[PDB]
Design a protein around this ligand. Structure first.
Ligand SMILES: Oc1cc2cc[nH]c2cc1O
Ligand SMILES: [Ca+2]
Ligand SMILES: [Ca+2]
Length: 279
């Protein structure tokens, strides 16, 4: 299948060169898999989700996304027009408030929640967890991320936007999960993207168009936008039967476009997420 005039990030992931505008993908499009977006919530009623999205847990007064960040990330994972895995099932867990902030204890609770909750869901092709969040190093937060991954969920986390070594940032510094850096449409590391040896892969993160609250759309930037590109790609590859939750990150790195990125510091991988689609 092919989405013509697709957002640059989607075209990039199914391309071997920058500057193309068609997103080529397998029609299975991630159906049968499930992706938990642990963020500010998801506007499930948005037309772009076609009823494939649902709030599953809040840690605040309401489960609605009053911020937009979570809805944006979810859209990149699996909305019809802006998503990587267009037929995946989306579950929202609101651990961040409408200002986009949350405390470590509730973020940890949200992760433990997902590890348990996936056991009551029908996700035959696999389960993915997308975490476009993070803060200063915390061994408890890293530990919660490692537990989720070991429970059998493919965990993808943002590297962070401090243009620094991701080793001092928690979600990102946990070695067992998939740490995602950001790149722009000219194949340069995004100027805000953290880097370092803990990064596993890079994904499109600068000026990413996706869904927004109020049934709208908006273009924003961040490793927060790169993360869902690979969470969505993992779901897509899992329903294709190419990999499993435990090895998806390594599989994505193994099959990535290598050496294409510029502005990559020595010691940081030069790998860009690639679906390897051949029609
Ligand atoms: O990168 C991000 C990190 C955190 C940490 C808490 N909320 C966040 C939202 C972000 O977009
Ligand atoms: Ca090339
Ligand atoms: Ca890793």
């Amino acid at each position: 299948a092919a989405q013509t005039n697709a957002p640059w990030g989607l075209a990039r992931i199914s391309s071997t060169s920058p500057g193309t505008s068609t997103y080529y993908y397998d029609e299975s499009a991630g159906q049968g898999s499930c992706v938990y977006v642990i963020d500010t919530g998801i506007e499930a009623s948005h037309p772009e989700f076609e009823g494939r999205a649902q709030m599953v847990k809040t840690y605040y007064y309401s489960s609605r996304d009053g911020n937009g960040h979570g809805t944006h990330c979810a859209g990149t994972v699996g909305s019809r027009t802006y998503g990587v895995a267009k037929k995946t099932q989306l579950f929202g867990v609101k651990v961040l408030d409408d200002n986009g902030s949350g405390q470590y204890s509730t973020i940890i609770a949200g992760m433990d929640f997902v590890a348990s909750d996936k056991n009551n869901r029908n996700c035959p092709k696999g389960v993915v967890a997308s975490l476009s969040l993070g803060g200063g190093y915390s061994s408890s937060v890293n530990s919660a991320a490692a537990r989720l991954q070991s429970s059998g969920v493919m965990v993808a986390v943002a590297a962070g936007n401090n243009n620094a070594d991701a080793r001092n940032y928690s979600p990102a510094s946990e070695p067992s999960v998939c740490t995602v850096g950001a790149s722009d449409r000219y194949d340069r590391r995004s100027s805000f993207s953290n880097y370092g040896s803990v990064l596993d892969i890079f994904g499109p993160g600068t000026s990413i168009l996706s869904t927004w609250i109020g049934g709208s759309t908006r273009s924003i930037s961040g490793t927060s936008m790169a993360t869902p590109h690979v969470a969505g790609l993992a779901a897509y590859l899992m329903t294709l039967g190419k990999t499993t939750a435990a090895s998806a990150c390594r599989y994505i790195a193994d099959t990535a476009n290598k050496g294409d990125l510029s502005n990559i510091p020595f010691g940081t991988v030069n790998l860009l997420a690639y679906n390897n689609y051949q029609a």
